[PDB]
Design goal:
part of a larger assembly, 4 chains, 174 residues, mainly alpha, Ferritin, elongated, binds chloride ion, binds magnesium ion, iron (chains A, B, C, D), iron storage (chains A, B, C, D), Ferritin-like (chains A, B, C, D), ferrous iron binding (chains A, B, C, D), Ferritin-like_diiron (chains A, B, C, D)
């Protein structure tokens, strides 16, 4: 038993490791999207940079779980990071739709972890999720939903001018 | 009788209270428009912020009437603030058309109050309306009319790209 | 269904709209108190400004619920804002007593919303209430209770000198 | 006829001279109040300074009418400045009551001048009164009414402590 461990259930420790893997999986998916939009035959560089930044944020989410695990006296256990579901991402609308789904998947995993933490009467873990993760997910989901509404307004996937304008005006200039 | 009261007709006092209610009504309508454009399935954030700012301006107009009433020795009497006419606002063109109508309605109420103040030989109230309200209405009506002309130019309501571009270029970036 | 919506119960969405109305109701009550203390036959201007600021804070609380509703994919539904319970507020002690009651009423509505959010297993909504609303209410209730104790110490309602001194020393100079 | 004169009725010219005299009369009354509160057996120095400043403001109002008269091509005609109605002013409450009456008397003279200017179709004179005089009177009347309400609250005329506190807290420290 770790000398620091107190009120930390084995099931929560394991669930934190699984969540860490999912954060790294999400980071790798966003890295793939970055590389796709950087292709010479895609060439939407502000969209590419949006996904690059999302990839870095997910890696930070992962690292925060590693630090959490050690703070509670659990032990980090790593597994393979599975490659993303696609090798190419179609266009800005398809990528944003995949990102929305991924953010929802990550959100559901965090909500399920909160359920477990609640069941095991772990208020520290509940607070950590509420203060560091759940609102970040709500914000990200809203941002991507707003993007999808604008992409549809701009006539994606058919309207190339619309896609060009989204890259210039809706995502940060890089 | 209030110790400060001089040359202030009961009819003007009552009309000032009614005008105060109308300013608060207009504020609430613009607040509704703000919330509509902030919806994830609408997502025109500069348009949303334009209406949020209009809502705050109307609240300031209301407060200025409250202060006026007390300065003249009248008594503020409040009534329910009726909810706006619509729960959803269609699109930027429909909202701007409703805003134009509302600004005209507010303008007519101010002009009618000026008529009453004139009839009751109240030059202080005439001056207050001319100096604090009437030109603000003319300016706002012109601004919204100019917007409507541009929205029609941009192909609203059908042209989604046009609507996107209006949000980026015609209203202040927020 | 909104594309952003996840783990957000219809009952919570409706309760958020009701809470929004109550915040706007509280804002309007404090606006009425402001106008009362600004009367030439009342003339307690620091008390008036205290209530004006409280009115603006409640409007901010309302706007925060509007933004929350949209972030979760719920839909803002507005109702009439009922006029305050009184047209005149007696004196500083009666107004502070009404403010204490109102802050308790708002607090109970927030606590009831937390109960509902708990029942529907919505940790994001729980966190939002805990982090943005519940402590603000506890602070406000304590501040007003402290004021009431001082008003009674100063001999309200009979002691006019006491009431004058409260305005000069207990509320911020405006 | 003055080479500059245009649309300026003889009756308005005469009424401007009478108004000038009334402004100087009001200045002299406030000067008397200043000297009274500066007496060693009165000794309310912030009250004294309030009246001194009011006296200087009235002299400025007079000078503005002199300049106006010449701008329109009328001719300044001066009359004796009558001494104030009282040689001693009782206390802060009696003086403020006399000041309220005097400000109302000045206001009525300005309103009567506006009536005359209206009758003679002189929009320049109407504007001058509205922009330079009428709101100043409304503000001053409200300020003095608020003072009287506070003086009564503080137990004037009997409550000497109340009178002392008014001088310390309600008027500007000099
Ligand atoms: Cl352990
Ligand atoms: Cl343990
Ligand atoms: Cl425990
Ligand atoms: Cl365990
Ligand atoms: Cl594990
Ligand atoms: Cl942390
Ligand atoms: Cl596998
Ligand atoms: Cl996919
Ligand atoms: Cl693929
Ligand atoms: Cl997914
Ligand atoms: Cl968070
Ligand atoms: Cl452009
Ligand atoms: Cl541009
Ligand atoms: Cl956008
Ligand atoms: Cl009255
Ligand atoms: Cl009157
Ligand atoms: Cl009159
Ligand atoms: Cl009347
Ligand atoms: Cl009324
Ligand atoms: Cl004003
Ligand atoms: Cl009705
Ligand atoms: Cl409408
Ligand atoms: Cl509707
Ligand atoms: Cl309308
Ligand atoms: Cl104006
Ligand atoms: Cl434009
Ligand atoms: Cl929904
Ligand atoms: Cl849901
Ligand atoms: Cl869930
Ligand atoms: Cl539901
Ligand atoms: Cl509802
Ligand atoms: Cl927030
Ligand atoms: Cl009802
Ligand atoms: Cl009440
Ligand atoms: Cl009442
Ligand atoms: Cl209540
Ligand atoms: Cl809080
Ligand atoms: Cl002090
Ligand atoms: Cl205190
Ligand atoms: Cl001449
Ligand atoms: Cl002439
Ligand atoms: Cl003419
Ligand atoms: Cl003539
Ligand atoms: Cl003359
Ligand atoms: Cl001038
Ligand atoms: Cl004589
Ligand atoms: Cl007198
Ligand atoms: Cl005398
Ligand atoms: Cl007089
Ligand atoms: Cl003025
Ligand atoms: Cl003191
Ligand atoms: Cl005072
Ligand atoms: Mg050990
Ligand atoms: Mg274990
Ligand atoms: Mg993450
Ligand atoms: Mg594989
Ligand atoms: Mg937080
Ligand atoms: Mg946004
Ligand atoms: Mg009275
Ligand atoms: Mg009346
Ligand atoms: Mg207005
Ligand atoms: Mg109705
Ligand atoms: Mg004017
Ligand atoms: Mg102007
Ligand atoms: Mg313009
Ligand atoms: Mg949809
Ligand atoms: Mg529902
Ligand atoms: Mg509140
Ligand atoms: Mg009712
Ligand atoms: Mg909790
Ligand atoms: Mg807190
Ligand atoms: Mg305190
Ligand atoms: Mg000549
Ligand atoms: Mg003549
Ligand atoms: Mg004067
Ligand atoms: Mg004489
Ligand atoms: Mg006029
Ligand atoms: Mg003015
Ligand atoms: Mg004041």
């Amino acid at each position: 038993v770790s000398q620091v461990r107190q009120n930390y259930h084995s099931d929560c420790e394991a669930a934190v490791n699984r969540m860490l893997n999912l954060e790294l999986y999400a980071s790798y998916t966003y890295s793939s999207m970055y590389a796709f939009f950087d292709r010479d035959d895609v060439a939407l560089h502000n969209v590419a940079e949006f996904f690059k930044e999302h990839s870095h944020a997910e890696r930070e989410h992962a690292e925060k779980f590693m630090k959490y695990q050690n703070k509670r006296g659990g032990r980090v256990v790593l597994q393979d990071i599975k490659k993303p579901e696609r090798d190419e991402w179609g266009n800005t609308l398809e990528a944003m739709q995949a990102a929305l789904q991924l953010e929802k998947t990550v959100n559901q995993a965090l909500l399920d972890l909160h359920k477990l933490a609640t069941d095991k009467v772990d208020p520290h873990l509940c607070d950590f999720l509420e203060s560091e993760y759940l609102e970040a997910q709500v914000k990200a989901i809203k941002r991507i939903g707003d993007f999808i509404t604008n992409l549809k307004r701009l006539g994606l996937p058919e309207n190339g001018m619309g896609e060009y304008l989204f890259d210039k005006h809706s995502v940060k200039e890089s």
